[PDB]
C-alpha cells in the first residue's frame, strides 16, 4: 500500500518546487532524492505520501541515547522511507536499516578562492582562520568521536569556541562568504555550491568515505527490494544522468 | 559454532603464506581479505574455518539462472561467510545478502605504456588491437548489458573473437604481456599491478563505480553486523591502512 516518505529540504535533494499556482501534495517537490523516489516507486510498484520530518532533523542521539529527525521516524514505525541525503554511520545504522548507498562522498573543505590553505593540516595548525561544521550533523559527530590526531585537533577547535558550529548549509555557506571562516562540508554539496557560487572552492581532497543510503525501519521488507533497484541504477548509468541534471548550474 | 568462509586465491587479497613448517587450517594464508577476515572475528567475536572454492569461480549465472563459485556456496548454505573480491551487483544481490562495500571501485583499462589511447573511445574506433575481460566475470556483464555507444560497440567486438575473454586476471596479465591486448580489469587490482609491471599502465579513468562486499546466505544474521563493523573499520581509517599495507610494491617512476 501506499508508504509513508519521512524528508527533509535539502538542495538540490528535496526543494520546494517554484510556481504561479499553489501546490498540494507530492507535487510540493523537486529534486534529486524527488526523482530517485520516483524511479523507485515505478521499479517496485509502491505509491507514497511524501511528509517532510517536524524538526527538520536528520537524526541524532541526546543524553538518553534518544534519536530524533527521520530516524526517530524511522524508528518509532510512524514512516516506512526516509528519502534524503541521509550519510551511513555506524552509529546510524546500528539504528535503522540502510540500503546501499545511492551516492558516495566524503567530508572536505568550502572556503573562498584565494587562500593558502591547501589540506587539512593547514587548517589545524592555525588558527586567525576559523573552521567548523553543522552541529550534531554526520560530519560533526565523525570529528568528535575520532581518535585520528589531526581530526580531535581540529574537534577540539570546534569544541572550544560553540560558533564555530553552524545550525544548517545555509548558516555555513553564508559565514563562508561573508567571513573568514571555512566550512566542513560533505563533497556532494560543495560540487552544487561551487558551480553556482564562482567565489567558493574546494580544499584539498577528501578526507574520509561515506555514502548517502534511503533509511527504513528496522527489518523492514523494503529495505533490500530497494537496494537491488538502487544497484540496478548504477549499472544502467541512471544514477549518474540524474546527479548530472540537478548538480550544473550557470558555470564559472 | 564456527562459520565456514569460503574464499578463493587472488593478490593481494587472499594468498598462500610462505614459511618453514607446513601449514594446517587458516595459518595457510594471509593478505588484504585475511586481515579483513580476522579484524571482524574480533570486533564481532566468532571463529571461522577458512576453506577454499572448489571450482573456483566467483558466481555467475547460466541460462536457466543456476549458480556456481562462492555464490552458490552460500544459496546452498555450505558457506556461512564469502569473504573475496567479490563484486557488488544487483543479479549476484538478489541471490545473496551482500554487507556494505568495504571498498570502491571501477572498471578501468589495463595496457602497455607506449600507445597514444587515452579512453575507452579510442580502443572502439579500432580493430588491430584485442580487447576483452575475464569470462563470466562482473566486468563482463557490464559491457553486455550497457546501453552506451561506446561500451556496446566493445561488447559486440567481445562477443565477436570468443577468445578475447580470458578465463581468469591471471591469463588476461600474461596476455597484456604477450599479445597486443587490452584488458578491461578492475581499478583496485590495476593499482596492484601497474606498481610491480613497470610496462603495465591505467588508461583513463573508472568506466563505473561499484564495490567489493562481503557475501552471506539470504537471511543471514551476520549481514547486518559485519555492515556495521566495516562502517565502523572506515570512520576509523583503518581499511585504509590496510590497503596501503597490501597496496605498495617498488613504485614505478
Ligand atoms: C545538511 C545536513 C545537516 C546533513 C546532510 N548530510 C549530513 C547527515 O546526513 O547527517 C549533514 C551534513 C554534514 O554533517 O556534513
Ligand atoms: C578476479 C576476478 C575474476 C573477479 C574479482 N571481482 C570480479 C567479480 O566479482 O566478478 C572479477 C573481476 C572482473 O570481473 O573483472
Ligand atoms: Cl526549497
Ligand atoms: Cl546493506
Ligand atoms: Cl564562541
Ligand atoms: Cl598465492
Ligand atoms: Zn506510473
Ligand atoms: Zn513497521
Ligand atoms: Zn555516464
Ligand atoms: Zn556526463
Ligand atoms: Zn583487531
Ligand atoms: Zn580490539
Ligand atoms: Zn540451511
Ligand atoms: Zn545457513
Ligand atoms: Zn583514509
Ligand atoms: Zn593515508
Redesign the interface.
Known sequence: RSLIVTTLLEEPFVMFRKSDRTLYGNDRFEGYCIDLLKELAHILGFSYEIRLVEDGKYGAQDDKGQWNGMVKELIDHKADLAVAPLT???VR??AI??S??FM?LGVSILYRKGTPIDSADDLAKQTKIEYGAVKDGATMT?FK????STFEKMWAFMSSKPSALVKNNEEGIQRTLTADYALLMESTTIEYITQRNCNLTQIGGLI???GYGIGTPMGSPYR?KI??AI??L????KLHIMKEKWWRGSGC
Open positions: 551511513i554511520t555506524a545504522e546500528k536499516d540502510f546501499k548507498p558516495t565523525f568521536k575520532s581518535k585520528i574520509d568515505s561515506k533490500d537496494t537491488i544497484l540496478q548504477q549499472e544502467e548509468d
